[PDB]
Design a binder for these strands. Structure first.
Lengths: 53, 136, 64, 380, 175
RNA sequence: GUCGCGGCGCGCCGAGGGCCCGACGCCUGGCGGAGAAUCAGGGUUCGACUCCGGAGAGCGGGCCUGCGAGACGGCCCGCACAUCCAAGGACGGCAGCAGGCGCGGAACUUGCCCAAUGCGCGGCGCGCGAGGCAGCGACGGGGAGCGCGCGAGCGAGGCGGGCCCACAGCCCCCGCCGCGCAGCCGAGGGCAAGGUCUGUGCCAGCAGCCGCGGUAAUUCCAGCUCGGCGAGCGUCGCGCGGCGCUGCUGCAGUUGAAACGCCCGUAGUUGGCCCCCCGCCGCCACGAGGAAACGGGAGCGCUCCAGGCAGGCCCGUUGGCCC
């Protein structure tokens, strides 16, 4: 039963949106998980971009 | 012995010159052994067996100890290595890769095998011990 | 009157299937059983006096 | 070469069957540099991965690496590959593989032969007897094996093979290194009590047999189908004068290997199958290569008719192309392997094929030339 | 990697001579008495005692009340007294010498549960701790060699969920 | 000339300068230190790599931009080896992280991601193969198993949920069923444990070493028991200890290995007694001042532990102090 954990009690709603780390906000479901890119897809696109503009 | 407060240099020089007198230090630190050893500082080495030969036992034991003439790939130096265990020469065939490792006497020869400085450990990439126990 | 004969003995040795053996107790249980072989019981290792673990006299009191 | 992969754990394998002949055309690759012998074997493995119709094997008898190809052009195509693409260049010499041979005694020996030892204190009298094929077939089958109680094989030999019952019981050992064809037998036994030293001397007559049976008197090839009979012997009382050094050489002169030759013969053969629709090339090629076609079975369901021809291994080189040309690439020599057969000519005669083939063997192995006489190593 | 930064160390010392039978027999007694699975557990406690006694040897040579003697003597005697390896009556650097593998083994918790009658035998006690049925301050311990302390001796007890009016079903009863 | 100093360069003018306290030459499978291994003491050996300082980006040169680079994920040239060609041209630089090849006895994934930790740019967040996270991993180190007890039970699993996580997963916590399982070397001596039974007969083999086997084998090959260590054990190579077999401590030289055949002799090393009072020494004591890691060590129950600096309503709560 014994558990150890930490609580961030934001005085107002905005401070949970701003001061808190973003992953913790999606982990409470406040935002909807987006599909970003594959990182390799970002880097390979940046490398094709670097050859042109 | 030299006994002066200012005789440190002489004492250091004597140790440096006298240290090489012990045979084991000369084998270890001269560097002649590192060039000569068919296994150059390696625990063991791979080779191809040109000839399967048996070396007659030195006295007083009488036996045809079974050996292989192997050409080590790293130095292209042909060597003789004992194939250990009973009737295990059968697994070795000429033109077959083998791994040869020392006899535990640091380049010396053990017991009645005359001039044998190493033992085969693995033939065709399979350990000799495993084959004799029929593990593989 | 005494190279081709590799395995003169190993090839010609009678094959004996190993005796059925009940699985021994492993771990501290083996340490307990070794403690029970000599330090406790004492009757197994005794011919009336302290004796070797594989004595022929100890055998036959242990069966084999 | 080929493999099967399954994500399913419990799935069976798939296998192929290349109709195009087999690795029939064989050649021995040998490096110019002995220190280039490790990189040859390495690039042969890689060349084996390339095509199933090529292989890379060592002949078991002479430890000679052999690359066998399915066509004369395909062996060259794989020799060019092995020469440069594999082994990255390097020097390698193709040659025909050496054909292995066996020696056999053909008839009972003319007379018992004495073998005085170096001490001159011990004498050995021997007779050479060819084993009957039916006994040899049972040796191969295992009805009579070295690894048996002495008496059980004796009953078999006397009760089926018409052997002398006492001789069958006294058989000392089988030959060569293994217990194949080749037997050593003891004396009459009335004089065994009278010989008095054979029991201690048995390990010398056994070790001499293990040598002679490995190397025949004619050309150093393995002896086969022979029974060596110590019809008689006289030995010194002391064991100082009776030892391996004294009696094992005396035994080898007395047994056979130039020392005891009486009737001798060399051996070799192989078997070829040809699916072929046209048998005209089949007969002409076999007749030239000295082979004989012993079979001709039409496949009942197909135009092609399969034949089987016993072909000498020595004359097999060249026949594959000859058969393609004798036919027109319609005939496919398939698998080639089999037993050994008696050479018709005798190694004793001069103009005989045998004495030519026999002298070539000791010239190849560098032993010596022309067997001169039993007198060279026989004591009268 | 800061993983490289993490220190690791061997915790035991092996015997100088492997086959000294008097010692091998004496060790077998300790293993059977204390239910120790392997000789390594016997060597780990020998190492712990060696260091502890090596430190008190060094300390004793230092002159009495030598500042470092006062500072390091306390942290030795007082940490041993808490562990309970030393009975609290002695309380002087002279008597750390005279400790034995049994003193360390006495506080293992395999022994502590046998001592207070909770476990009939050391062999049973090891089996009990590995099934999460023993507790110290209501801590479900899976470690037979817990090395329990003097104050935490009273707290050692059967676990809340194992035998005293608990679920008492999973395992044999559930069938 | 340079940022400056200086033969740093150049004239000029001398003839110095260094050395048996080993100069110079040669060689290295030479990066150095903090340290690592072993370990009474005095030591020996290794200093790839984790931090610090050096050096280098196929091999030489030369530069530009710069506050700083003689920069190579800049440029130019020669060299060495390449690449694409439409035949005229162009264009390389994994001693970054993956991955291949070659080599060797040997050494991981062609993952996922900036969420931490720092750095760059931006004040309201992007980038980073720095890193973090998994995967592989008997280098190793740690902690538990293979039963207990006559009755109960587990954990290894399996499956959902939490929790965790950048996202998974892992641990852990839950309910719910529940599947415990040993190897590797040995039994003549050193060195612990068969005078058991077969096979074999100086064969095969064993055996570091001494030695075993030539027909009643304590040594081989099996079975049988039994030992030792144990999820590891055996083997091979190396370093240390052993070893006072390198000897400063602390070796030996009549005969075991070893006093030069003798005498003079320079450096070198070593010097009788002698002045109480200081000047310079060396010497010794204690100072400052000097990176951490590590090692030693204070406190602290990560379930114990290898650890980690945590933690608890708290010395200015800690994180001292020693090297």
């Amino acid at each position: 039963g014994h558990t150890v954990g930490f609580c961030n009690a934001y005085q107002n709603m905005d401070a949970l949106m701003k001061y808190e780390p973003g992953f913790r906000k999606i982990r409470c479901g406040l935002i909807e998980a987006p599909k970003p890119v594959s990182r390799k897809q970002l880097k390979n696109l940046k490398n094709r971009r670097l050859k042109k503009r | 012995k030299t006994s002066g407060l200012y005789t440190a240099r002489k004492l250091r020089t004597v140790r440096r010159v006298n240290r090489w007198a012990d045979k084991k230090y000369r084998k270890a630190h001269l560097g002649t052994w590192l060039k000569a050893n068919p296994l150059e500082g390696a625990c063991m080495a791979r080779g191809i067996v040109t000839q399967k030969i048996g070396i007659s036992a030195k006295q007083p034991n009488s036996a045809v100890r079974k050996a292989v003439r192997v050409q080590l790939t790293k130095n292209s130096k042909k060597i003789t290595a004992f194939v250990p265990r009973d009737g295990s020469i059968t697994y070795i065939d000429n033109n077959d890769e083998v791994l040869v490792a020392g006899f535990g006497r640091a380049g010396r020869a053990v017991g009645d095998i005359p001039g044998c400085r190493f033992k085969v450990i693995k033939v065709a990439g399979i350990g000799l011990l495993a084959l004799f126990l029929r593990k593989r | 009157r005494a190279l081709t004969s590799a395995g003169k003995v190993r090839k010609c040795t009678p094959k004996k299937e190993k005796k059925e053996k009940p699985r021994p107790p492993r771990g501290r249980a083996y340490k307990r059983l070794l403690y029970n072989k000599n330090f406790v019981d004492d009757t197994l290792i005794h011919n009336g006096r302290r004796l070797g673990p594989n004595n022929l006299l100890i055998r036959q009191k242990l069966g084999f | 070469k080929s493999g099967t992969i399954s994500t399913y754990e419990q799935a069976h394998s798939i296998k192929p069957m290349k109709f195009s002949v087999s690795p029939v055309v064989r050649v021995a690759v040998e490096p110019a540099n002995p220190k280039d012998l490790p990189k040859l074997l390495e690039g042969m493995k890689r060349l084996d991965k390339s095509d199933p119709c090529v292989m890379c094997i060592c002949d078991k008898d002479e430890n000679q690496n052999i690359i066998a190809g399915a066509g004369e052009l395909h062996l060259e195509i794989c020799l060019k590959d092995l020469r440069e693409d594999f082994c990255g260049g390097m020097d390698i010499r193709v040659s025909d593989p050496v054909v292995s041979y066996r020696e056999t005694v053909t008839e009972k020996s003319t007379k018992v032969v004495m073998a005085k030892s170096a001490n001159k204190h011990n004498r050995l009298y021997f007779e050479a007897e060819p084993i009957s094929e039916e006994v040899i077939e049972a040796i191969k089958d295992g009805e009579i094996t070295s690894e048996q109680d002495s008496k059980v094989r004796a009953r078999i030999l006397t009760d089926k093979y018409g052997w002398d019952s006492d001789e069958a019981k006294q058989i000392w050992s089988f030959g060569p290194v293994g217990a194949s064809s080749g037997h050593m037998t003891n004396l009459i036994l009335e004089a065994t009590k009278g010989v008095q030293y054979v029991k201690e001397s048995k390990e010398h007559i056994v070790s001499g047999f293990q040598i002679v049976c490995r190397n025949g008197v004619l050309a150093g090839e393995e002896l086969v189908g022979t029974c060596f009979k110590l019809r008689d012997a006289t030995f010194h009382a002391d064991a100082i004068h009776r030892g391996a050094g004294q009696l094992t050489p005396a035994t080898r002169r007395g047994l056979y290997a130039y020392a005891s030759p009486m009737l001798m013969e060399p051996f070799y053969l192989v078997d070829i199958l040809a699916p072929e629709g046209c048998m005209g090339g089949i007969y002409s090629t076999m007749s030239k290569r000295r082979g004989v076609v012993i079979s001709e079975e039409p496949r009942e369901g197909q135009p092609l008719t399969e034949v089987k021809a016993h072909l000498p291994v020595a004359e097999s080189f060249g026949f594959d192309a000859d058969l393609r040309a004798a036919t027109s690439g319609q005939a496919f020599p398939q698998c080639v392997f089999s037993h050994y057969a008696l050479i018709p000519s005798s190694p004793l005669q001069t103009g005989s094929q045998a004495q030519g083939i026999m002298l070539s063997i000791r010239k190849r192995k560098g032993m010596k030339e022309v067997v001169p006489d039993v007198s060279e190593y026989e004591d009268k | 990697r800061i993983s490289r930064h993490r220190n690791s160390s061997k915790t035991y010392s092996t015997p100088k001579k492997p086959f000294t039978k008097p010692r091998l027999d004496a060790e077998l007694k300790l293993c059977g008495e204390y239910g120790l699975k392997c000789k390594r557990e016997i060597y780990r406690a020998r190492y712990m005692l060696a260091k502890i006694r090596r430190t008190a040897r060094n300390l004793l040579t230092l002159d009495e009340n030598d500042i470092k003697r006062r500072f390091e003597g306390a942290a030795l005697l007082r940490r041993l007294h808490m562990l309970g390896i030393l009975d609290e009556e002695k309380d002087q650097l002279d008597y750390v010498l005279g400790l034995r593998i049994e003193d360390i083994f006495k506080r293992r918790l395999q022994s502590v549960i046998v001592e207070s009658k909770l476990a009939k035998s050391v062999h049973h006690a090891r089996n009990m701790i590995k099934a999460r049925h023993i507790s110290v301050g209501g801590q479900i311990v899976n470690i037979p060699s817990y090395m329990v302390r003097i104050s935490n001796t009273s707290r050692v007890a059967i676990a809340d969920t194992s035998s005293l009016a608990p679920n008492g079903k999973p395992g044999r009863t559930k069938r």
